[PDB]
Amino acid sequence: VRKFTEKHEWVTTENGIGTVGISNFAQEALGDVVYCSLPEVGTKLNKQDEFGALESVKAASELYSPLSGEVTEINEALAENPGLVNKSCYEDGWLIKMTLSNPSELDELMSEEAYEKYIKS
Amino acid sequence: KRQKGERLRLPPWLKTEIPMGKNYNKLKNTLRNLNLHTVCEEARCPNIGECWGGGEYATATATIMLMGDTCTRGCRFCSVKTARNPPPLDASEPYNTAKAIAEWGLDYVVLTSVDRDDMPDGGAEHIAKTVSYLKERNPKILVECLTPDFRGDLKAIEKVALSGLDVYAHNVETVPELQSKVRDPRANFDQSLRVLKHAKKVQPDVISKTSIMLGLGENDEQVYATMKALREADVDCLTLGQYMQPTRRHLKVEEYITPEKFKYWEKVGNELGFHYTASGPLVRSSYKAGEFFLKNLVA
Ligand SMILES: C[C@H]1O[C@@H](n2cnc3c(N)ncnc32)[C@H](O)[C@@H]1O
Numbered sequence A: 001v002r003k004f005t006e007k008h009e010w011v012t013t014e015n016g017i018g019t020v021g022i023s024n025f026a027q028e029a030l031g032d033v034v035y036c037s038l039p040e041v042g043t044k045l046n047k048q049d050e051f052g053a054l055e056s057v058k059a060a061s062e063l064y065s066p067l068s069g070e071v072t073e074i075n076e077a078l079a080e081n082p083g084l085v086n087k088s089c090y091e092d093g094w095l096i097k098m099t100l101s102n103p104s105e106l107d108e109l110m111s112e113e114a115y116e117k118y119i120k121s
Numbered sequence B: 001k002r003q004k005g006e007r008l009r010l011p012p013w014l015k016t017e018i019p020m021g022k023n024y025n026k027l028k029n030t031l032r033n034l035n036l037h038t039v040c041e042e043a044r045c046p047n048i049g050e051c052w053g054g055g056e057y058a059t060a061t062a063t064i065m066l067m068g069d070t071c072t073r074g075c076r077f078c079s080v081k082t083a084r085n086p087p088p089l090d091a092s093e094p095y096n097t098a099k100a101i102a103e104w105g106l107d108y109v110v111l112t113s114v115d116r117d118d119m120p121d122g123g124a125e126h127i128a129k130t131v132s133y134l135k136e137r138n139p140k141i142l143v144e145c146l147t148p149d150f151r152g153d154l155k156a157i158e159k160v161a162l163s164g165l166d167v168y169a170h171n172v173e174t175v176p177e178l179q180s181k182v183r184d185p186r187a188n189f190d191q192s193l194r195v196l197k198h199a200k201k202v203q204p205d206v207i208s209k210t211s212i213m214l215g216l217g218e219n220d221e222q223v224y225a226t227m228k229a230l231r232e233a234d235v236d237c238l239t240l241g242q243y244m245q246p247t248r249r250h251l252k253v254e255e256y257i258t259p260e261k262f263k264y265w266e267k268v269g270n271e272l273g274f275h276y277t278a279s280g281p282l283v284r285s286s287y288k289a290g291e292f293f294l295k296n297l298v299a
């Protein structure tokens, strides 16, 4: 169960924890990622709040929150291997993990098959 | 210090958006159906969103890359794939290219290609054929060709300059001092200059054009000497843009040139006598080439 945002961010939930990353379409557009600006653990985010940024060799994009919640963990493997988000955007290349202050916000995100039509139409 | 020791952070004036929209997917669908490639995609150009699309309500264009997506050369700045034995030429690509441009309705079209040093004529006939199919379907259409150097083969250059094109483009890329560090060693400044000079003598009515990348370690004295040598070779148009690292395994940016400094280099091009000088950080050889041509050469 993977939902998407209009800014090409995905989220998956398990045990009340949302794992946030960027889609495969976005990382392909961005290229080889070099630096990931991630928020400190404990940051309280609102939906669509700008919580970070990604810098690639030939591109840069901002990261916007798909949910309202509190940041619980950041992917520490991105400091030594930032290329994980390019070739593991849905698994090892995740960015942050957060709580869900308002789980009903998941209905505002599009499904995985609605997002493929979103980028192809 | 600034590269090969550290990394320079991307300045804000180089950030672009993820390509998106209906025009962008229309162009993509056409290219995949016809088995065509673009330099925009393979060189990972940051302007794809702007050139290919818009808001869905604009004039979409893209620079088709002929002769496959795999080059025989390994330029240290170029993210186009490299292989010693590229696949053979698709003879229908010159014909399918004219179909894609007829579909897009372009009045101005830019064509380019990978280098095919494995080909006896460097693929010049394959390029010239695409131009002929375009002019056959639309004689008034304006076509610009960003061609390889053909390793200085004068017969290969002639074949392209006789195809009927309007603009003959070939990029010098960098200053003469950095040719061996930046380009594939099969290219050099004197050879690139010989290409642009010869196309004029093959067809004196075509417009010659070349591009330079800044930020690879050159200094201003070398840049002005390069621009000065280009006017003495009778090159009409000039493009200057910021070099940007396309892949972590390609060259690091030595310096990020400010926007004001590109505006200065536009003035130098006007002082030297270029018919137009497209200058700016995100400017590339094909970037808004139609606008620059029509606003400056038909004016
Ligand atoms: C196709 C044209 O686009 C330019 N080009 C190709 N790759 C890059 C890059 N990383 N950065 C800047 N310009 C590039 C070259 O000038 C080339 O000739």
Ligand SMILES: *C(=O)CCCC[C@@H](S)CC
Binding pocket: B039, B040, B041, B043, B044, B045, B046, B063, B244, B246, B284, B285, B286, B287
């Ligand atoms: C990265 O800067 C690649 C630039 C490619 C320029 C193409 S799209 C036009 C010639």
Ligand code: MET
Binding pocket: B039, B112, B113, B114, B115, B146, B147, B148, B149, B170, B171
């Ligand atoms: C896409 S690279 C530019 C055109 C040609 N392949 C050259 O380097 O001369």
Ligand code: SF4
Binding pocket: B071, B072, B073, B074, B075, B078, B079, B080, B113, B114, B115, B148, B184
């Ligand atoms: S000749 Fe050089 S710049 Fe042109 S496509 Fe091949 S590698 Fe890229």
